[PDB]
Design a protein around this ligand. Structure first.
Ligand SMILES: [Mg+2]
Ligand SMILES: [Mg+2]
Ligand SMILES: [Mg+2]
Ligand SMILES: [Mg+2]
Ligand SMILES: [Mg+2]
Ligand SMILES: [Mg+2]
Ligand SMILES: [Mg+2]
Ligand SMILES: [Mg+2]
Lengths: 328, 328, 328, 328
């Protein structure tokens, strides 16, 4: 298939590697790939993480310097600040290179052209599908985990080899898998979730609360229990991740199965339309524009919506309640 | 408020109590309330659970006999079979009673008139909001848990007292809480979830998969990882149950927050309409009719939909994958 | 291709075979497969057909007994009564079996779950496409005829072999063909005809009559002649079955060809919509529910519609006329 | 009620106060509150107003210095330039403070998060409802005037006291009143006027002119007289402010009253829809984004619309006319 389960580690042996950022991701990948016998350094600004990383036994330099000494670099920082960092500190040093490899964990800034490296550079991606805390939770067991691979620019005919070597170095395989894809697909996927079923779910819950309270005389303290204040949803999610999404429902009552299936097949087109609209809005590059402009304006809509959500009735009731149950 | 946190246990002391059914619920409530010093018996047909219950130290009789000996009874069996049991075995013995108390965990069959006990009987409800496994997980810690209370028929002016005494007996308070409500509200709530946001969520996920695969050239093995094959959703659910639904999003990236909030406020009316329609369909008693008739016909729609869901492309891909990851 | 033209008869030799029902189908298949050298018995209730079958040289037992003695059984009875018969008389005997084969001529009751045999049984289908009278009309000539094959449950890895052996035993091949399909496809097809073009045709004819009479001053005795009282339609149908549907029109006038083709391509979408709606209504299992419930209610709609059709003006005129022409 | 008519002046006595800006507002408030016995300084850049303020007897420093010396500050400058000034000159000095008070006359930049002061600061608002010229026109008479109060951040439990002390210091009470509200309400109100009835009025007038001229053969010189070139509207406005909006109409003819009332109740929903749309557009923070982005782009739409309005036919005719009447 398109799938990979283990591969070689030939190309990274003898080369120096630089990890930009020491947050959750960078810390994890760096620690692991050091355990796998690789000369590793760190590039970060002098702050909390700087002291932490030098404490854990890493030689720490400044970013631009870390790139000078390195033949391979991992740009593990938020997608909201990477642009300026790349423009000021990296791109110069990079114009003054010969054969370099640049790896990302997200394809947002590259899929949309906000970062356009030269042609003397191999541009790749290695994107996990885990929070990062669980990833150590799994490496201690010798387990692997899944990732996505992508190549944007091959100037060596060796990019895929580097990508698989990296996947092995951070301990995703063997034990997990590695799928080959594009920068575009990764961005599309990471965003379609955040735009389609998460907000839909939240809005449906909120609407159920509002309706029950204002049209059937229900007490808030009960609506909250039924809808989300119980750990009902987490159990469903676990059974989904373990047994399967549909086989999960065998553990429930026939009444529930019937209602769920009927109403699912009844409302499938409505949401399909929405998903089409949003995926198209993304594929074109409109959302990136929207978001960048909001940053340039000062995050007013963000602010107002954060306010409106927290000053809603449901949230106040939830506050009173969580206080009563002792939940912090 | 409408809320209760602890109460007396005066009325159940000296009286005999019968637990109909020894599934998850009955087993739990029976064991606990026996620990709290109450003369308890069991009424069940001779099967697996019969041997189990007599093994665990319970004197087991037959249902009708268990009702003759009892002054209080808990009808803890599925809502799909309770009707016949009540008609044949219970109602007769019950016509031959003087002062009786009948408790339910679900208000479906009573809210809709499928079970109409006499007026010489106090009819009440005590409905938890926990799977049942977690309930023992909490009693061992001396903790409580939430429940709903309701009264349909008071022939003694003491029903609420009995209900609170019961809530205490099974170990929901103190430690948890007890809300007072109707049979109608409990049914409405239990059903609105199964009809509004669960199926909507599932359909949205399925639509995202289909779209990504058939319009943007994505590989199935990646769509599944992004959407639900990762334990992403369970972590969200936990943070919701613990920190709150909206405060949960602070742990994510600003991009995600922005997209989520915007698209949530953008699609709130659409789902509100759906929720209105379904809640109205329930309040009237139409769904109960639908479901009863399907039972009488032989579950053809149920069958066909179970087939169509499992024979879908997403499910086959999920099967191949879970096999690859080792997940049973 | 997916097609079969002749096959072996290995598995049925040495085994006993029971034919449930002695109507048109059962009589035919039984007689033939006896001619092909197979030990055959009959299972039926004591009525007309019982005496007929014992007369024609068949040893006749009672149904349950016929199943005890048999290793293979053909359930050739109407789809409207098979359920009770299966529940009472067959299923018990069948729980007390080891290796059994159960064959149907229709997939209605199984495709929709109204009959769910165990897993120790091989469940198959062999469905002809002939009225039954014509089938003897063809066997006397050594000819075959078409059938459909399907397998729902294989517990022996030999089901298809049994199905082909059966197809040969009843004399459908060689001489005809045998197509492999599902229970679902057979039901879908048998029903889509009865729901799409038969009623459409009838309604169009009726509308033409009504229009001609009430808006253009035509006499009934003439409308009936043009539309269906002539043997015009039967000749068209024959030429269709023989020469082909479109090549059939070469024998008509150019005017007719032109009008037919134009108006056919002009009204294709309208009927396509209808066919979609009805096929979807079937695939889901809704029509089975509808029909079962009507049976349980007492056939009121059936009754009223039979009345309205026969008490229409067209029918009365047809009666007067057929009386005049001497047609009984 | 929510209303205030006079209050104490305890907290401002002994403290130094800095007035940022010496335009109309700053000049007025500063002069007055100096008359009321308060140590007052000014912070402004060296321009016309600088010389004016030092002339009128005020010790003038530079902005950042004025904040260092002050325990209370009034940020009386346009909402279009305050952001940069706050970011560069104020925020630093303010990080280096202990207990400070910051007052605004407009809630735009704060309601929408374009200015987010720290938590060691009390953030308040005191917003008048007068042009500023009339305010001196009223103080010379010992009169007061209305204002709105708001508090965004209380770090001292004394904010409201400071706000009322300020309201008194500038001479709004006693003599006028002081209403308590939010930053959000003030912005919402200031904007809803500028978006709902002002532009509607103007467009209606323009449409009346266009219609009369191009469909009924009227001369421009007459349409202008009827619609706005007469001082008709000002008298109506005065009678509104004095006698009331509806009681104002008693001074007109019954014909006018009838037409006005009928057509008012006839077109109330249409404009209600518009007002809803615009108020919602504001509450969310969309207009702030729109306006900020237009500034960043270079005011092209602003430019083009200013041109189109002044190059319209009505404006040219008005020019010819005002020239004829001698009106400059
Ligand atoms: Mg994601
Ligand atoms: Mg993300
Ligand atoms: Mg529930
Ligand atoms: Mg339920
Ligand atoms: Mg047919
Ligand atoms: Mg048929
Ligand atoms: Mg204004
Ligand atoms: Mg203004």
């Amino acid at each position: 298939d398109k799938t990979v389960l283990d591969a070689n580690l030939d190309p990274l042996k003898g080369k120096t590697i630089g990890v930009i950022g020491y947050g959750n991701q960078g810390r994890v990948q760096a620690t692991i790939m050091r355990e796998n016998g690789l000369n590793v350094i760190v590039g970060n600004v002098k702050d909390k993480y700087y002291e932490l990383a030098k404490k854990e036994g890493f030689e720490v330099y400044e970013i631009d310097e870390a790139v000078r000494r390195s033949d391979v670099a991992l740009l593990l920082i938020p997608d909201e600040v990477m642009k300026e960092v790349y423009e000021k500190k990296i791109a110069p040093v990079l114009q003054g290179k010969k054969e370099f490899v640049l790896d990302f964990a997200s394809g947002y800034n590259v899929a949309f052209g906000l970062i356009r490296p030269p042609k003397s550079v191999d541009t790749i991606m290695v994107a996990p599908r885990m929070v990062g805390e669980g990833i150590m939770d799994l490496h201690k067991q010798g387990k692997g985990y899944p990732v996505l691979l992508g190549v944007k620019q091959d100037a060596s005919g060796k990019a895929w080899d580097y990508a698989k070597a990296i996947a092995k170095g951070i301990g995703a395989i063997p034990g997990g898998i590695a799928v080959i894809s594009s920068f575009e697909e990764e961005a599309l996927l990471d965003l379609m979730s955040e735009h389609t079923w998460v907000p839909i779910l939240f809005g449906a819950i909120k609407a159920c609360y509002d309706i029950a309270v204002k049209e059937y005389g229900v007490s808030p303290e009960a609506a909250l229990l039924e809808f989300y204040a119980s750990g009902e949803l987490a159990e469903i999610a676990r059974l989904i991740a373990e047994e399967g999404i549909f086989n999960q429902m065998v553990h429930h009552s026939t009444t529930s199965q019937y209602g769920t299936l009927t109403r699912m097949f009844k409302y499938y087109d409505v949401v399909r339309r929405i998903v089409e609209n949003e995926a198209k809005y993304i594929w074109d590059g409109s959302f990136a524009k929207e978001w960048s402009l909001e940053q340039q304006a000062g995050y007013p809509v963000f602010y107002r919506l954060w306010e409106l959500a927290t000053q809603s009735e449901m949230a106040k009731a939830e506050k009173e309640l969580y206080k009563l149950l002792g939940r912090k």
